[PDB]
Amino acid sequence: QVCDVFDIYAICACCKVENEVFNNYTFRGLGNKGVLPWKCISLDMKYFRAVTTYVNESKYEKLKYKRCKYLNKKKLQNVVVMGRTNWESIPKKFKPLSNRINVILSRTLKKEDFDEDVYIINKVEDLIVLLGKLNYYKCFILGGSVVYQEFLEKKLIKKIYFTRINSTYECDVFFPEINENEYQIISVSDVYTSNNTTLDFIIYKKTEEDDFVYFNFNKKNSIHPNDFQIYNSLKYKYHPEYQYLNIIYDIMMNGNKQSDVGVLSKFGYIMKFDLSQYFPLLTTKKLFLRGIIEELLWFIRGETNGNTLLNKNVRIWEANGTREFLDNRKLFHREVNDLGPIYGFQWRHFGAEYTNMYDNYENKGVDQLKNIINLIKNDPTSRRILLCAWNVKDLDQMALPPCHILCQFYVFDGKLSCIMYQRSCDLGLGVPFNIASYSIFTHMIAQVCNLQPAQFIHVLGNAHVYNNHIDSLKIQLNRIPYPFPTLKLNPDIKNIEDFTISDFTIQNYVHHEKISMDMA
Amino acid sequence: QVCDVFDIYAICACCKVEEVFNNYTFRGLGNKGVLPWKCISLDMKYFRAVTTYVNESKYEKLKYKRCKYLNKETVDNKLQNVVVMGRTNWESIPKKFKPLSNRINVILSRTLKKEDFDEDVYIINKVEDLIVLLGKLNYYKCFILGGSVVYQEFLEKKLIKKIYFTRINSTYECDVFFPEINENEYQIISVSDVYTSNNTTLDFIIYKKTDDEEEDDFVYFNFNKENKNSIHPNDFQIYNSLKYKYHPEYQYLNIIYDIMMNGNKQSDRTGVGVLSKFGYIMKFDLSQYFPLLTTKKLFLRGIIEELLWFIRGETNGNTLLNKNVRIWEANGTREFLDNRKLFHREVNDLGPIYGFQWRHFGAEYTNMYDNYENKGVDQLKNIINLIKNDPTSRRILLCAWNVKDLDQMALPPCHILCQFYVFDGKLSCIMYQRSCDLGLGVPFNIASYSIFTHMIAQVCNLQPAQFIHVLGNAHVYNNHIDSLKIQLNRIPYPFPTLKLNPDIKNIEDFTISDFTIQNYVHHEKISMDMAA
Ligand SMILES: NC(=O)C1=CN([C@@H]2O[C@H](COP(=O)(O)OP(=O)(O)OC[C@H]3O[C@@H](n4cnc5c(N)ncnc54)[C@H](OP(=O)(O)O)[C@@H]3O)[C@@H](O)[C@H]2O)C=CC1
Ligand SMILES: NC(=O)C1=CN([C@@H]2O[C@H](COP(=O)(O)OP(=O)(O)OC[C@H]3O[C@@H](n4cnc5c(N)ncnc54)[C@H](OP(=O)(O)O)[C@@H]3O)[C@@H](O)[C@H]2O)C=CC1
Ligand SMILES: Nc1nc(N)c(-c2cccc(Cl)c2)c(CCCOc2ccccc2)n1
Ligand SMILES: Nc1nc(N)c(-c2cccc(Cl)c2)c(CCCOc2ccccc2)n1
């Protein structure tokens, strides 16, 4: 195959184009009015230069050998191929592309029409003849859409280096629909922010050593890894959603079978999400945030009245407030939906005597939420900046003891990080919401303290997958994450108590379709 | 030059012999013509896998090298390894195991000959006869299986390229010994995980004579990578020299390295200066070892008395000071309490700290002398009852962070909570630590909660599994950096074991004499401030 002999690759960047359904074809915008749809995305410029300039002299020998064999026979550079329209779009000061052998496809222009150190070729076949005559490492097709269409059509592309630009622009030219039977995603990068958009980089592919063994001399759950074909097919799984999906995989393959309803469990994990780069709302199924933002606002108001959330059509706590649920807790003297001294009460009134959900607890008990905001502002190197919901004295009065034990804060160089320790983690249903809740809370605390958010760090104690979620989670693990969305806060909010639901916007959420974790 | 062309390695297992420690601590080979120990099945398994493994696809380069060396184009002019045994060694092996399967057996003997023996098992009577025999064989590697006498001469004659050395961390009567490996002539390049087999810990160390399509994609995904701090390269030469660092002590040492290399410069209360990072997890397998650091010397009497004091529910610092346990002495002074605004607190009245929260959470603290019997929540009793009666509970947590009482404490607890997990008769524990002094505090903290896990496991009739240490604010004091650079260049020894008196079946019944550390092999003490 000519793409394998001559190492022909495509590299492109695609944005989104003007109950949405998402698929890989979501990312297809290439151009508008003969230029790019976006103003500079500097990180993609940096990636593009690194990929198209990188050469490995030690691997050249084998490539020269392979091409000589196939053909019957100063510094090494890559070849870059551009359509004439692409070429004319590039600013003069960037042309010819530095440290690369520049090739232009044109019928209307000939070598006499160019001042620059470029090769002009007038048909695809003449590129292959040219590649036979040059010393080069790899050949990158740089676009635009006519050039990509014809090279993909002729199966002349070994891999596509595809930048997913997670923002929407006016486009008039599009990357061709990639045929799923001809090209497979094999690698996915980390998620980044550049020039007020998130993006990632994916790769489509055409469809002492003895001592390691010795140390390995001493190396289950009716899970069939051929149930995880796509998941196990990927080479590089660098997208941060894989911190979650890898824990699911680990519990399924290595988990302990336990009772209450079956689970598989393991003990002790950590996930870290870079909130400066993305908002980690899972993309491998559809999540909604209205409920968990109302929950957080209800916590911050210090409320324990389940009816407040129910009147907003938020049902997160409904089951924990029923007559039957409260009586099974021995809370015979608790009104329905009076959840007792749970999160909000502990955050604003730790150590106060709970009475009922209607009482006015003003200036009763410890306002640890106000205290941690004061420590972050006035004593940011403190190792005591903890917010703790696990009030040992009050546990049996709560509808149930908190899962989210504590949040600890860390301030360095004007940036806020947060650790949340979770004693009990429902990986299939609860953890995706819990990541989103404490990520939003970190943003709120950072803003009211005039800081930038850095990391949300999630520590999982008892980490379990319900046996009833296994089939749904096998479906999810075989989906490839999309670049994450971004969270916007109203910058006018200066105090933790002053946020309302319209002060939060999730932008550029691209996701696979919703999953029922339990299939009735 | 020879040992490199013919790939001649030594494989041995050494015990300790019947207090300063060094590599030569591990030198026991034999007693009265047999092995000093009863039988260590994991070393048997390692020995068999190492001495039998061969890689067909890597032979061409070995044969090529050997032919070139011997001025030949072919060996003669199923790939196996050669194993070389002393006659005493050979005559100590039982019949059913001789000759050693899937290996070319060679025996050094001056007094026996090929007539006395059989098959394709070679006798040789000089060491030079091995080199000519290797010149004439197709084999992968050559392993010297010893005898003291055999290792002695092969090491003198400089004929060993690597030593595969098993460290058996227990003491036996020995009459023969492995030669002192000179530090200038051999260096450790790799160290394994620590195991238990047949009532001893052991590890495996290695001494050395002193589709690449997806390979570029790795370079592309790395295009945005930067190494902050003015710690030097040469300064961690031994640490950076090792290839495989599988010993569990590296979970601690790798965090020190990470903080030194990538940590954030901050200035804490005493303007000492730290390097800090946020969020780590260490996991220690208490079924296989007791994780007492071996790269410096650590003492445990104080740390045990501290836990016994917590378990009694005590808050009286004088109790510990009267036993010369001075861990809380700084936090109980008039000056320290006054600076905490505890003007009405007696000296060494630490307030409602760990022991009070563990036995009496929510009770009104009065003074360190009051009778709190039956006041507040006995969380320690409650978690023991949950482990025994509801072991799949996800609510088995023991929490010292009482938000209501923090300001009454001499200081708020560093060790926020313990969570327990029970599976298949085994107990694991997570401890979450808000503030971690990596150089001085964390080594003790790992020991304290590993001991506590053993005590809870034992009173609940469970076996300990993991101790899992979660670090929040993890910092290295700038005044510890020189000492931690010395420590990171020390290779760990196999870990000791903890033995509890097995008769103790109630958490309140332990006494200092119920705790024994066995087989603690450690580098020299380090004063973390002004290098020792
Ligand atoms: N986002 C991204 O990754 C990229 C975006 N772009 C954008 O794409 C748009 C330009 O793309 P589009 O208009 O398709 O134009 P192209 O850059 O694909 O250029 C088309 C021209 O190349 C020549 N050509 C193509 N194939 C051949 C052939 N086989 N033999 C001879 N000549 C050939 C012809 O030139 P002639 O007419 O002179 O014969 C043809 O008109 C722009 O908006 C640009 O900004 C460009 C590349 C990448
Ligand atoms: N812990 C471990 O890893 C190991 C321990 N052992 C233990 O060590 C002890 C046995 O070793 P040790 O007593 O030294 O005996 P060795 O096995 O070293 O055997 C010594 C005999 O080998 C022959 N020999 C040695 N060198 C030569 C030579 N250069 N040329 C010809 N023959 C040579 C001689 O036998 P002859 O008299 O026939 O000439 C010599 O007397 C036992 O207690 C055994 O269990 C053994 C192996 C490994
Ligand atoms: N991933 C990726 N792939 C691409 N093929 C391009 C692209 C877009 C238009 C023209 C050209 Cl030559 C390249 C970019 C856009 C970033 C690089 O844009 C250029 C940088 C330097 C010189 C020319 C274009 N990103
Ligand atoms: N790491 C290590 N190295 C070794 N050189 C030996 C050793 C000890 C005595 C005799 C022999 Cl042949 C080997 C062992 C002991 C485990 C294997 O011991 C035997 C193997 C086969 C037959 C008899 C003993 N472990």
XYZ file of N, CA, C and O in Angstrom, chain A residues 272-397:
504
model
N -7.862 13.246 39.279
C -7.505 14.679 39.305
C -7.989 15.315 38.012
O -7.769 14.752 36.969
N -8.729 16.401 38.105
C -9.280 17.092 36.927
C -8.758 18.526 36.933
O -8.851 19.186 37.981
N -8.227 18.970 35.797
C -7.645 20.322 35.672
C -8.738 21.295 35.223
O -9.019 21.465 33.978
N -9.333 21.982 36.187
C -10.468 22.890 35.933
C -9.995 24.146 35.166
O -10.858 24.826 34.595
N -8.704 24.444 35.155
C -8.172 25.548 34.305
C -8.300 25.149 32.823
O -8.312 26.029 31.980
N -8.404 23.865 32.490
C -8.370 23.380 31.088
C -9.734 22.921 30.609
O -9.904 22.802 29.394
N -10.651 22.566 31.492
C -11.941 21.981 31.054
C -12.859 21.835 32.275
O -12.364 21.888 33.420
N -14.143 21.666 31.987
C -15.171 21.282 32.975
C -15.444 19.795 32.767
O -15.877 19.392 31.711
N -15.133 18.922 33.756
C -15.179 17.482 33.559
C -16.586 16.896 33.720
O -16.801 16.027 34.584
N -17.483 17.325 32.861
C -18.800 16.656 32.700
C -18.650 15.494 31.742
O -18.313 15.723 30.537
N -18.886 14.267 32.209
C -18.700 13.074 31.360
C -19.405 13.261 30.020
O -20.562 13.731 29.974
N -18.756 12.797 28.961
C -19.245 12.902 27.582
C -19.683 11.527 27.090
O -20.291 11.502 26.012
N -19.385 10.442 27.806
C -19.721 9.080 27.317
C -21.176 8.685 27.610
O -21.577 7.556 27.196
N -21.917 9.559 28.247
C -23.391 9.485 28.393
C -23.813 10.912 28.673
O -22.930 11.746 29.009
N -25.103 11.186 28.588
C -25.694 12.531 28.789
C -25.947 12.759 30.277
O -26.558 11.918 30.930
N -25.434 13.858 30.780
C -25.681 14.329 32.151
C -26.362 15.680 32.018
O -26.139 16.340 30.988
N -27.144 16.059 33.019
C -27.759 17.397 33.201
C -27.318 17.941 34.562
O -27.141 17.166 35.515
N -27.138 19.247 34.667
C -26.582 19.877 35.880
C -27.604 20.717 36.662
O -27.225 21.171 37.747
N -28.814 20.973 36.148
C -29.731 21.893 36.862
C -29.930 21.406 38.318
O -29.785 22.229 39.222
N -30.282 20.136 38.490
C -30.559 19.497 39.789
C -29.356 19.635 40.711
O -29.521 20.056 41.882
N -28.157 19.308 40.222
C -27.013 19.295 41.162
C -26.598 20.729 41.444
O -26.029 20.912 42.513
N -26.877 21.719 40.567
C -26.599 23.130 40.929
C -27.631 23.576 41.976
O -27.229 24.226 42.901
N -28.910 23.243 41.833
C -29.930 23.612 42.863
C -29.564 22.948 44.213
O -29.639 23.598 45.239
N -29.112 21.713 44.173
C -28.679 20.964 45.387
C -27.581 21.747 46.096
O -27.667 21.947 47.301
N -26.577 22.193 45.371
C -25.432 22.927 45.934
C -25.903 24.261 46.496
O -25.455 24.673 47.606
N -26.799 24.960 45.805
C -27.319 26.250 46.315
C -28.114 26.013 47.624
O -27.992 26.825 48.551
N -28.929 24.969 47.666
C -29.675 24.519 48.871
C -28.706 24.181 50.009
O -28.940 24.640 51.128
N -27.592 23.499 49.715
C -26.545 23.211 50.734
C -26.042 24.541 51.293
O -25.978 24.795 52.530
N -25.696 25.459 50.398
C -25.028 26.719 50.820
C -26.014 27.577 51.618
O -25.583 28.294 52.519
N -27.316 27.497 51.345
C -28.323 28.246 52.145
C -28.449 27.610 53.550
O -29.032 28.264 54.449
N -27.868 26.435 53.755
C -27.968 25.682 55.022
C -29.293 24.912 55.128
O -29.603 24.428 56.177
N -30.034 24.758 54.058
C -31.363 24.106 54.091
C -31.302 22.589 54.287
O -30.337 21.888 53.805
N -32.350 22.062 54.930
C -32.535 20.621 55.171
C -33.943 20.194 54.747
O -34.273 19.024 54.943
N -34.715 21.118 54.198
C -36.130 20.919 53.796
C -36.145 20.341 52.373
O -35.894 21.111 51.407
N -36.390 19.047 52.274
C -36.537 18.300 51.014
C -37.579 18.927 50.096
O -37.425 18.792 48.841
N -38.599 19.606 50.649
C -39.726 20.133 49.819
C -39.189 21.295 48.969
O -39.719 21.529 47.885
N -38.215 22.063 49.461
C -37.619 23.128 48.651
C -37.139 22.563 47.303
O -37.377 23.215 46.244
N -36.415 21.460 47.308
C -35.907 20.864 46.046
C -37.078 20.286 45.245
O -37.101 20.500 44.010
N -37.989 19.575 45.900
C -39.140 18.949 45.195
C -39.968 20.020 44.470
O -40.400 19.745 43.372
N -40.127 21.210 45.042
C -40.881 22.334 44.444
C -40.131 22.901 43.229
O -40.767 23.598 42.457
N -38.824 22.648 43.096
C -38.005 22.976 41.899
C -37.910 21.776 40.959
O -37.079 21.836 40.049
N -38.699 20.728 41.164
C -38.682 19.462 40.383
C -37.261 18.867 40.392
O -36.817 18.259 39.386
N -36.580 18.943 41.543
C -35.298 18.237 41.779
C -35.613 17.108 42.763
O -35.986 17.440 43.900
N -35.424 15.849 42.382
C -35.889 14.660 43.137
C -34.735 13.883 43.758
O -34.955 12.781 44.191
N -33.543 14.458 43.803
C -32.296 13.787 44.239
C -32.537 13.217 45.649
O -32.064 12.149 45.932
N -33.202 13.959 46.526
C -33.387 13.570 47.955
C -34.776 12.986 48.226
O -35.069 12.659 49.400
N -35.616 12.857 47.209
C -37.039 12.492 47.434
C -37.104 11.178 48.203
O -37.816 11.158 49.207
N -36.439 10.112 47.738
C -36.515 8.762 48.326
C -36.039 8.751 49.787
O -36.491 7.923 50.547
N -35.130 9.643 50.163
C -34.540 9.679 51.521
C -35.439 10.447 52.502
O -35.083 10.494 53.699
N -36.548 11.037 52.032
C -37.431 11.837 52.883
C -38.786 11.188 53.082
O -39.622 11.812 53.751
N -39.018 9.998 52.538
C -40.356 9.383 52.647
C -40.619 8.939 54.091
O -39.675 8.666 54.870
N -41.904 8.839 54.432
C -42.336 8.250 55.734
C -41.631 6.918 55.958
O -41.108 6.689 57.082
N -41.641 6.022 54.957
C -41.103 4.646 55.076
C -39.598 4.731 55.297
O -39.047 4.023 56.179
N -38.931 5.566 54.504
C -37.452 5.684 54.593
C -37.114 6.205 55.985
O -36.282 5.590 56.644
N -37.713 7.333 56.401
C -37.461 7.911 57.759
C -37.771 6.895 58.862
O -36.955 6.763 59.753
N -38.887 6.147 58.779
C -39.218 5.141 59.822
C -38.172 4.017 59.842
O -37.831 3.554 60.949
N -37.673 3.569 58.683
C -36.632 2.504 58.633
C -35.348 3.042 59.280
O -34.595 2.239 59.810
N -35.162 4.357 59.283
C -34.021 5.011 59.980
C -34.328 5.193 61.475
O -33.498 5.806 62.145
N -35.518 4.772 61.955
C -35.995 5.046 63.335
C -36.210 6.543 63.555
O -36.130 6.978 64.701
N -36.537 7.310 62.525
C -36.843 8.756 62.688
C -38.378 8.915 62.643
O -38.901 9.603 61.746
N -39.043 8.329 63.637
C -40.529 8.252 63.767
C -41.058 9.653 64.022
O -42.147 9.936 63.547
N -40.258 10.542 64.635
C -40.673 11.913 65.046
C -40.183 12.963 64.047
O -40.078 14.161 64.411
N -39.794 12.543 62.851
C -39.351 13.470 61.784
C -40.479 13.656 60.769
O -41.005 12.641 60.275
N -40.775 14.899 60.443
C -41.725 15.190 59.351
C -41.167 14.647 58.029
O -39.960 14.740 57.785
N -42.061 14.169 57.155
C -41.711 13.824 55.757
C -40.881 14.945 55.128
O -41.243 16.131 55.235
N -39.815 14.552 54.442
C -38.849 15.429 53.719
C -38.074 16.332 54.665
O -37.399 17.250 54.135
N -38.144 16.085 55.980
C -37.224 16.750 56.939
C -36.018 15.835 57.062
O -36.065 14.829 57.799
N -34.964 16.172 56.320
C -33.799 15.278 56.111
C -32.869 15.314 57.327
O -31.994 14.466 57.422
N -33.117 16.186 58.290
C -32.295 16.221 59.505
C -31.007 17.003 59.225
O -30.888 17.687 58.207
N -30.018 16.926 60.128
C -28.824 17.791 60.064
C -27.774 17.269 59.059
O -26.653 16.922 59.449
N -28.158 17.281 57.785
C -27.330 16.805 56.642
C -26.455 17.984 56.163
O -26.397 19.027 56.807
N -25.829 17.844 55.004
C -24.748 18.731 54.487
C -24.960 20.191 54.845
O -24.058 20.754 55.480
N -26.060 20.794 54.404
C -26.271 22.255 54.519
C -26.248 22.732 55.961
O -25.598 23.776 56.301
N -26.845 21.942 56.844
C -26.872 22.209 58.296
C -25.447 22.151 58.857
O -25.052 23.069 59.620
N -24.672 21.128 58.464
C -23.289 20.939 58.961
C -22.428 22.071 58.409
O -21.557 22.535 59.130
N -22.583 22.419 57.138
C -21.771 23.501 56.516
C -21.979 24.860 57.183
O -20.974 25.620 57.285
N -23.186 25.170 57.650
C -23.497 26.513 58.216
C -23.672 26.462 59.732
O -23.543 27.511 60.311
N -23.893 25.294 60.351
C -24.363 25.224 61.773
C -23.793 24.010 62.500
O -24.397 23.619 63.514
N -22.614 23.509 62.115
C -21.998 22.317 62.758
C -22.009 22.509 64.275
O -21.433 23.491 64.798
N -22.569 21.547 64.993
C -22.535 21.530 66.463
C -23.784 22.128 67.100
O -23.943 21.955 68.292
N -24.636 22.817 66.349
C -25.951 23.311 66.794
C -26.871 22.106 66.960
O -26.593 21.048 66.334
N -27.831 22.221 67.889
C -28.859 21.183 68.111
C -29.881 21.274 66.977
O -30.566 22.298 66.810
N -29.984 20.253 66.174
C -31.013 20.284 65.111
C -32.363 20.220 65.842
O -32.505 19.368 66.766
N -33.351 20.952 65.365
C -34.738 20.868 65.891
C -35.634 20.349 64.784
O -35.954 19.183 64.841
N -35.918 21.178 63.774
C -36.694 20.770 62.583
C -36.217 21.631 61.411
O -35.501 22.643 61.616
N -36.729 21.337 60.235
C -36.281 21.982 58.977
C -36.755 23.418 58.879
O -36.283 24.095 57.987
N -37.696 23.868 59.731
C -38.232 25.223 59.643
C -37.522 26.177 60.596
O -37.838 27.340 60.575
N -36.692 25.683 61.497
C -36.191 26.524 62.590
C -35.220 27.532 61.985
O -34.680 27.287 60.938
N -35.022 28.639 62.659
C -34.053 29.669 62.243
C -32.794 29.415 63.069
O -32.826 29.697 64.239
N -31.727 28.888 62.490
C -30.495 28.546 63.249
C -29.466 29.698 63.194
O -28.260 29.410 63.402
N -29.894 30.941 62.921
C -28.980 32.116 62.738
C -28.026 32.183 63.923
O -28.458 32.067 65.067
N -26.734 32.261 63.631
C -25.635 32.338 64.623
C -25.605 31.118 65.553
O -25.029 31.242 66.617
N -26.201 29.974 65.194
C -26.040 28.746 66.012
C -24.989 27.842 65.330
O -25.068 27.655 64.094
N -24.094 27.270 66.124
C -23.097 26.286 65.681
C -22.053 26.969 64.819
O -22.068 28.222 64.701
N -21.199 26.176 64.188
C -20.013 26.682 63.457
C -20.357 26.862 61.986
O -20.708 25.892 61.305
N -20.180 28.090 61.503
C -20.320 28.393 60.068
C -18.978 28.047 59.391
O -18.134 28.956 59.110
N -18.754 26.774 59.092
C -17.427 26.391 58.552
C -17.328 26.908 57.112
O -16.210 27.187 56.699
N -18.427 27.077 56.378
C -18.339 27.608 54.999
C -17.778 29.041 55.013
O -16.767 29.315 54.336
N -18.311 29.894 55.875
C -17.741 31.249 56.044
C -16.296 31.142 56.530
O -15.462 31.986 56.088
N -15.995 30.233 57.456
C -14.635 30.117 58.037
C -13.643 29.724 56.922
O -12.498 30.223 56.946
N -13.977 28.787 56.041
C -12.982 28.333 55.020
C -12.801 29.461 53.982
O -11.692 29.651 53.474
N -13.828 30.226 53.691
C -13.677 31.374 52.754
C -12.707 32.391 53.379
O -11.819 32.892 52.598
N -12.814 32.652 54.694
C -11.931 33.601 55.422
C -10.505 33.072 55.434
O -9.567 33.909 55.335
N -10.299 31.758 55.609
C -8.933 31.176 55.613
C -8.315 31.308 54.217
O -7.151 31.677 54.159
N -9.074 31.009 53.161
C -8.561 31.087 51.776
C -8.155 32.545 51.478
O -7.090 32.747 50.910
N -8.944 33.527 51.905
C -8.639 34.973 51.673
C -7.484 35.430 52.544
O -6.626 36.149 52.024
N -7.474 35.092 53.826
C -6.601 35.766 54.811
C -5.439 34.875 55.189
O -4.451 35.425 55.672
N -5.523 33.543 54.996
C -4.409 32.670 55.443
C -4.266 31.533 54.437
O -4.353 30.369 54.819
N -3.997 31.859 53.152
C -4.058 30.887 52.067
C -3.065 29.716 52.130
O -3.388 28.696 51.545
N -1.987 29.806 52.902
C -1.028 28.695 53.107
C -1.463 27.800 54.285
O -0.764 26.827 54.532
N -2.562 28.108 54.973
C -3.131 27.225 56.025
C -3.269 25.789 55.518
O -3.818 25.597 54.411
N -2.921 24.809 56.366
C -3.219 23.371 56.099
C -4.478 22.922 56.835
O -4.695 21.688 56.925
N -5.293 23.882 57.290
C -6.513 23.627 58.076
C -7.764 23.999 57.290
O -8.822 24.129 57.919
N -7.695 24.198 55.970
C -8.851 24.729 55.243
C -9.704 23.524 54.829
O -9.507 23.050 53.696
N -10.480 23.028 55.769
C -11.349 21.819 55.614
C -12.788 22.143 55.908
O -13.089 22.835 56.919
N -13.674 21.576 55.117
C -15.124 21.696 55.295
C -15.643 20.277 55.497
O -15.409 19.472 54.553
N -16.245 19.942 56.636
C -16.461 18.529 57.024
C -17.952 18.317 57.265
O -18.514 19.042 58.132
N -18.583 17.399 56.527
C -20.022 17.109 56.691
C -20.274 15.966 57.682
O -21.452 15.766 58.083
N -19.248 15.185 58.023
C -19.336 13.978 58.886
C -19.294 14.378 60.352
O -18.246 14.321 61.030
N -20.461 14.716 60.853
C -20.647 15.091 62.251
C -21.097 13.841 63.000
O -22.300 13.517 62.941
N -20.158 13.215 63.677
C -20.308 11.902 64.367
C -21.533 11.963 65.298
O -22.293 10.975 65.377
N -21.706 13.079 65.986
C -22.780 13.252 66.979
C -24.140 13.176 66.282
O -25.114 12.696 66.899
N -24.229 13.648 65.044
C -25.518 13.911 64.379
C -25.857 12.811 63.391
O -26.959 12.874 62.842
N -24.967 11.861 63.134
C -25.150 10.893 62.029
C -26.549 10.231 62.113
O -27.158 10.041 61.046
N -26.959 9.730 63.279
C -28.194 8.885 63.358
C -29.430 9.786 63.165
O -30.505 9.265 62.898
N -29.290 11.115 63.314
C -30.405 12.081 63.102
C -30.572 12.403 61.607
O -31.578 13.028 61.209
